[PDB]
Symmetry: D2
Subunit: 343 residues, 4 copies
C-alpha cells in the first residue's frame, strides 16, 4: 500500500529549493568547517583559533563583492555560524539570503568505527535530527549536508560498509525532507591509496547503486535531493597518469550508469585536488560529449577559499586582497559549471 511520505505542496517546495541551488551557473560554497578543521587551517595560516577569528574569516567569505552573486547558489554553514552576526549587525543567514544564496547546514555528528571491518567507518547523528531540522528550518536553513566516508582498500569497501552507510544516508534524507529541508547526499570515496581509475569507477558505481536503492526503500523524493559525489580519479599513490578528459569520461560514465535522471543536480567535491585542477576537471566534465540529464556543478570547501585564506594571512588590512582571490575562484568555477571555462 502507499501512504505518501509527502503531500504535493511539500514536494513542490522541495523541488523549488533544489532548483534554486543548482540553477545554471551556480554552485555551493562549503563553509561548514568545524572548530577542529578550521583550527588546523587557522594554525596553518599562523593565527590563533578563536570565535572572533572564525567569525571574521567567514565575513571575509560571505560579505564578498557582488560579482559572486550569479555564482554562489548556496552556502553550507556549520552550526555556530548560523548564530553569528556580521559586524554590520545582520545575521549571516540574512547576509546570504539577501544576495540570493540558499542556506545549508552540516547536520552530521561525525564518523564512528564499524567493528569487525578494516578501518571502515559509518556516520553518526540521527538522534533528535527532526527537532534540529525544524529549528534550522525556522532559522533560515533550506538545505542540509551529511558526509559519509568510504575508503578504497585491499578488500574494502566491504558489503557492510556500503550497506550501512547507504542506510544512514537514506534515513537522514527521509528526516530532512519530512522537515522541509533539501538533503544533499554525500557518499565520499577517499582518494587515499594507489588505484587506477578503473577501480575508482567500479567502486563508485557500486556505491551509488546501493545509495539509490536505499533511497528507494525509504520513499525518498528524488526531485527534492541533490547528489554530492567525488570525481572519479586515481589514488594519490597511483603511478599511472590520466588526462583530464579521461577523468571526465570516467566520472560522467559512472554517473550515467547509476543516478536516475530525476535527481536535480550533482555537486562535486574538490577532494584535496589542487585549487586550479578542480575547475579544470569540472570544466572537462561539463564538456563531455554525452547526455547528462542533471545539473553538474561544484560544492567546493577548499578549492574556493584556499587562495583567499593564504592571502588573508590573519591580518585585517589584507581583507580586500583576500576577498578578491576568493571572487576569482568563484567566477572561474562558475564558468566551469557551464563548460565555458578556460585557464
Amino acid at each position: 500500500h502507499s501512504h505518501p511520505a509527502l503531500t504535493p505542496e511539500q514536494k513542490k517546495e522541495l523541488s523549488d529549493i533544489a532548483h534554486r541551488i543548482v540553477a545554471p551557473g551556480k554552485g555551493i560554497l562549503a563553509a561548514d568547517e568545524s572548530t577542529g578543521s578550521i583550527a588546523k587551517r587557522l594554525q596553518s595560516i599562523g593565527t590563533e583559533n578563536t570565535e572572533e577569528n572564525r567569525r571574521f574569516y567567514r565575513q571575509l567569505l560571505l560579505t564578498a563583492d557582488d560579482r559572486v552573486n550569479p555564482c554562489i547558489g548556496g552556502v553550507i554553514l556549520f552550526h555556530e555560524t548560523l548564530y553569528q552576526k556580521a559586524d554590520d549587525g545582520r545575521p549571516f543567514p540574512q547576509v546570504i539570503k539577501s544576495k540570493g544564496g540558499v542556506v545549508g547546514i552540516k547536520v552530521d555528528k561525525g564518523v564512528v568505527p564499524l567493528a569487525g571491518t578494516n578501518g571502515e567507518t559509518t556516520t553518526q547523528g540521527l538522534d533528535g535530527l527532526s527537532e534540529r531540522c525544524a529549528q534550522y528550518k525556522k532559522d533560515g536553513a533550506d538545505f542540509a549536508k551529511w558526509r559519509c566516508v568510504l575508503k578504497i582498500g585491499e578488500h574494502t569497501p566491504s558489503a557492510l560498509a556500503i550497506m550501512e552507510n547507504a542506510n544512514v544516508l537514506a534515513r537522514y534524507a527521509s528526516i530532512c525532507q519530512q522537515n522541509g529541508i533539501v538533503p544533499i547526499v554525500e557518499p565520499e570515496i577517499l582518494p587515499d591509496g594507489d588505484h587506477d581509475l578503473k577501480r575508482c569507477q567500479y567502486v563508485t558505481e557500486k556505491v551509488l547503486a546501493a545509495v539509490y536503492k536505499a533511497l528507494s526503500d525509504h520513499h525518498i523524493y528524488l526531485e527534492g535531493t541533490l547528489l554530492k559525489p567525488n570525481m572519479v580519479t586515481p589514488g594519490h599513490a597511483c603511478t599511472q597518469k590520466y588526462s583530464h578528459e579521461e577523468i571526465a569520461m570516467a566520472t560522467v560514465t559512472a554517473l550515467r550508469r547509476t543516478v536516475p535522471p530525476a535527481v536535480t543536480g550533482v555537486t562535486f567535491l574538490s577532494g584535496g585536488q589542487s585549487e586550479e585542477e578542480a575547475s579544470i576537471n569540472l570544466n572537462a566534465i561539463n564538456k563531455c560529449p554525452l547526455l547528462k540529464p542533471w545539473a553538474l556543478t561544484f560544492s567546493y570547501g577548499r578549492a574556493l577559499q584556499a587562495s583567499a585564506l593564504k592571502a588573508w594571512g590573519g591580518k585585517k588590512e589584507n581583507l580586500k586582497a583576500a576577498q578578491e582571490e576568493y571572487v576569482k575562484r568563484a567566477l572561474a568555477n562558475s564558468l566551469a559549471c557551464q563548460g565555458k571555462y578556460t585557464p
Copy 2:
C-alpha cells in the same frame, strides 16, 4: 576487485546493436507468439492452427511493403520461426535483415508458481541458455526477450516476487551479454484488477528500482540493454478516468525516478490496450515536457497486427489487404515514437 565481464570489443558490439534497434523512428514488432497463443488467435479468426498457417501469417507480417523499412528496427521471433523459410526461399532471418531489421528471439520457457505467495509466479528457462544463445547468435538473432509477470493485488507484489523476478532477469541478461546478444528486460506489471494510477506508479517504481539494483549486482552493461516496461495505467476494473496526458506524465515520471540514463532505449508494451489507444498514449509520452534521456519507442505484438489479422481472415487472396492494415499501424506508431503522430 574487478574482473571485467566484457572486453571493450564486446561492449562495443552490444552498444551498436542496441542503438540500431531503437534508432530514431524505429520500434519492435513482436511476432514471438507461441503455438498456444497464436493457437488462440488463429481460432479467433476461425482458421485451423497448423505450421503452414503460422508460417504464412508470419510471411504476411515479415514480407510487408517497403514503407515499413524506416519503422521496424527489430522483430522478435519465436524459436520455430527462425527455422522457417519464406516461399521465395529466403529464411525469415534474412528476410528481416535484408530490409534493415534486427532479429530477436524469445528465450524464456514460461512462468512457474511461487509457493507460499498469492498467485505470484516467477519465470523459467535459464538452463542451457548459454548454448542456446550461442546457437541463436550463429543463426542471426541479435537480441533476446524475456518476460516476467507481476500482478498488482491486495498484498501483492510481495517482496519475494520482486526479488526473485529481478534476480532471474539479471541472470538472464548476464548470460545473453556473455554470448553477444542484447537482452531486453521486460518486467511486465499486469493491468488486471482495479487500482488507480497512483498505485500502478508506486508499484512500477518499486519494481524498476529492484530490477536495476539486481542488474548492478550482476555486473550487467547497461548501454547494451533495452528496457521493455508497461505504460503506467489504471487497472481494467478501475472506475476513475484519466486523460492520456496523465498516463503519459505518470509513465515518464516513473521512468525518470528509476531507469539510469545509460540505458539505451525503452520499448513499451501495448498490454491489452486498444490498437489505436496504444499509439495515442505513446505519442503523449513522447510529447511530455520533461527531459527523457533515452529512446522511448514501441514493442507491440498485438497493437500492430490486430487489424492485419482480422482483415486477413485466413484467406490468401486477402493478403494484400491484410498487409496494408499492418503497414498503416506501423507508420502510425513510427510517428508516435517521434511525438509527431496525430489521429
Copy 3:
C-alpha cells in the same frame, strides 16, 4: 577477509556475563521505567511523581528479602537510577551486585516515526553510544537493553520497518559488545489488533530471521547476546480462544525455526499479560515437549511489580507488605522458568 571484532578475552567475558544472567532458575527484573511511564503508574497509585518517590519505590524492589537471591539474575535500570543511593548509603548498583544480580541499563532514546509507512516507527539513540557504554561499564552495568517496536497490521510490518529495525538492533549490539556489555536484543511485536496465533507466529518468524541475518552481517558474537522476544499470542481484539499449550507450542516453534542455538538465553516479555498469566504461559513454554537449546526465562517489568506496586499504595508503612507481594511473584516466575511452577 576476517578482522576479528573481538579478541578471545573479550569473547570470554561476554559469554561469562551472559551465562550469569540466565543461569538456571534466574530471570530479569525490569526497573527501567522512564519518568514518563513511572509517572503514569505513580499517578495510577495516586502518588505525586518526584525523584524521592521513584527512588523509594526502587528501594522497595531492590532491597527485597534474600528469598529473591536465587531468582533475579539481572536488573535493568534506567539512567537516573544508577546514580541514586539507597538510604543505607549503598549505590543501587552495589545493592544489586551484592546479593548476586547483574546490572543492566536501558540505552535507547525512544521511537521515531518512519516516513512513508503506516504508523511504523524505528528506534533512536545510537549517537555517542560507545562513550555512554564505556561510562556505564565503569559504573557497574554489565548488560544493556534496547527496545524496538513492530506492530502487526493490515499491510504492516512493512519490509522497511523490519529491515531498518533489524539494522539498528545489530548496530546497537555491535557497539555494546565493543565496550564489554552484553546486549539484549528486543524486537517487540505489539499485541494490539485482532489477529490469530498463526499470523503472530508468521510475523515473529520473519522478524527473527531478519534480526539474525542482520546480526550476522555486523559480526555480532552470539554467545555474548541475549534475546528478548514476545511470546506468540493472539491480538487483544482476537475473538478466537487458545489454550496455554497452544501459545507455548507456537512460541517454541517460532523460536526453533529462527534463533540459532549459540544464543545464550531467551528472556520473554510479559507484554501487557495478566500478572499470573505470564508465569503460566512461561511454565507451559518450559514444559513443551520439544528440544530447546537455550535458556528460556523471564524479563518482567510489570508482571513482577504490579501487585507490589498496588499493595504499596505510596505509604511507607506498607513497605513490608508490598515487598512480600513482589517476592511471591519472583519465586513463582523462578519456578516458571524451570517448568516446575503450578498455580
Copy 4:
C-alpha cells in the same frame, strides 16, 4: 499476509521422511556419481565405462550384506540408476526400500560460470523441476540432492556468489517440498587453496547465514529439510596442522552460530578426505562437549566406497571381497555418527 505453502499433511509427510533418513545411527550413501565422474573412477580401476559395469558396481553397493541395514538410512541415486534393475529382477528403488533405505536422487544439472567474478560458479537445473520431482516421487524417490559450489580465494566468495547460490538453493527446496520430496541443501565450500581454519569457519558462517535467510524468504519448512555442509578444515595447501578436536570444535561452532534447531539433521560431506580420516573427524564431531540440537551424521560418496571399489578391481569373482570392505566402512561410520567409534 500468510498463504501457507504447505498443508499440515504435507508438513507431516516431509518431517516423517526427514526423520527416517537421519534416524539414530544412520547416514546416507551417495551413489549419485554421473557418467563423467564414474567414468573417471572406472578408468582409475582400469575398467571400461559401460552401462553394465556401472549397473553391476551399483549392485555391489546396493545388494550388500544385511549388516548394513541399521547403517544406511538413505541412498542418493543418479537418474539412470533409478531405472536400472538388479539381476534378481528387482528395480534398485525396491532393493533399497526393501531393507529399509530411503531413495534420494540428484536433481541438479551442474555448474555454470558467473560472469564478472573470479572463477565463481552457480548451479543449474531449475527448469521443469516440478514435473521431474513429481515423476521421481512416483518412482519411489523420497529425497533430493542439489550441489552448489563455493571456493575460498583471495577476494572470493563474492557477495554475488553467496547471494545467487543461496537463492537457487532456496528455489530448489521450495519446488521439492511442493512435490513432497525432502530437499538436502548442500552449500559445499571447496578445500582447495591454502587457508587456516579461522578463514574456513568465517566463510562457512557467512554462507550458512545467507542460506537460511534465503530459506526464510522462500517460505521453506525447515523441519522437512536436511543440511549437507562440509566439515570446517584448512585448505589442502595450508601448512599449519590441526588436531581432529580443533576441526570438530570449529565445525560444531560454525553450525551452532547459524543453523536453527528446527533443521532435522546435518549430513557431512567427506570432501576428498582420507577414507579413514572422515570417520575420525565425524566421531570427534559427535564427541564435542557442546549442545547440538540436530542429528549429525554422514553422507559419504567416496569415503564409503573407495576400498570397495579398489578391492573389486572390475572382476566379478572379487564381488564378495569388495562388498565386505564397503560393509566395514559403513559400520565404522555408523559408530562415528553415534560418537562410539574408535580406530
